[PDB]
Ligand binder design. Structure first.
Ligand SMILES: [Cu+2]
Ligand SMILES: [Zn+2]
Ligand SMILES: [Zn+2]
Ligand SMILES: [Zn+2]
Lengths: 153, 153
């Protein structure tokens, strides 16, 4: 089993800690933790290509997309590797994150270690927003907080 | 060619940006950038095992040492993978860094992507200090700033 971690920070009050664990090579990855300081409701959640925080979250590049596919969310084969849909902040602006994803990995050519996890201002429309950008990015607005994904003990 | 980058931050004023470039698999890695806020003089400069910033630089773990060697200088055969050259700050607190290292790598068994770069309170003694601890850590004092090493464009 392999593990990773990410501390999310930005220019505002959004802060979080997200853990990753992958029991088997090419197996599902458990993603869990908490993000606070968010507005209630849906916030886009993505792995961006570059683990480059030199210009804050702006230098993280586009969605991690090694298979050169369209943006999506629900369907494993019809998304970018980095598309992790939305986190949901409850009434108190805390998102309790707990999901399992079978497309990201902590090794091999879908590996996310050394890349940037980003939480967004707005909901990701999952590719169904009805415009061209929806199929590129999901229209999730600004990057509120991010961090580089590191190897964990 | 591949590339990496690291933004070093801590609780004090020490901060910086360090770039990595490796033109060939298992070839030398150029390491260059700048760190500010430092006391004039030598400062230890290490790759630590874990890219875990959840307890600040403390959660980075030990020197990256996949070959289970003693601590040394970068030019020694007996060294940890993570034992890089000390950086040197001028009077104004700025260490402009430019080195090459042939033991770290951006892929393979010595890969440092997803690990942590740390700049220290004082000089690394290169394992030539006059105590036992010298050949464990190099006696470089506290961890002033650190960051996770990410994939760059
Ligand atoms: Cu160190
Ligand atoms: Zn995004
Ligand atoms: Zn996407
Ligand atoms: Zn060492």
């Amino acid at each position: 089993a392999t593990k990773a971690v990410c501390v999310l920070k930005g220019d505002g009050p959004v802060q979080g800690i997200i853990n990753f664990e992958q029991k088997e090579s090419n197996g599902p990855v458990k993603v869990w933790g908490s993000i606070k300081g968010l507005t209630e409701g849906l916030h886009g959640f993505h792995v961006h290509e570059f683990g480059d925080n030199t210009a804050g979250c702006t230098s993280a590049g586009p969605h991690f997309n090694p298979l050169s596919r369209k943006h999506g969310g629900p369907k494993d084969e019809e998304r970018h590797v980095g598309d992790l849909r939305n986190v949901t902040a409850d009434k108190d602006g805390v998102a309790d994150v707990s999901i399992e994803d079978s497309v990201i990995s902590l090794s091999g050519d879908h590996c996310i270690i050394g890349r940037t996890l980003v939480v967004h201002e707005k909901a990701d429309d999952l590719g169904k927003g009805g415009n061209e950008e929806s199929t590129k990015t999901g229209n999730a607005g600004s990057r509120l907080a991010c961090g580089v994904i590191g190897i964990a003990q």
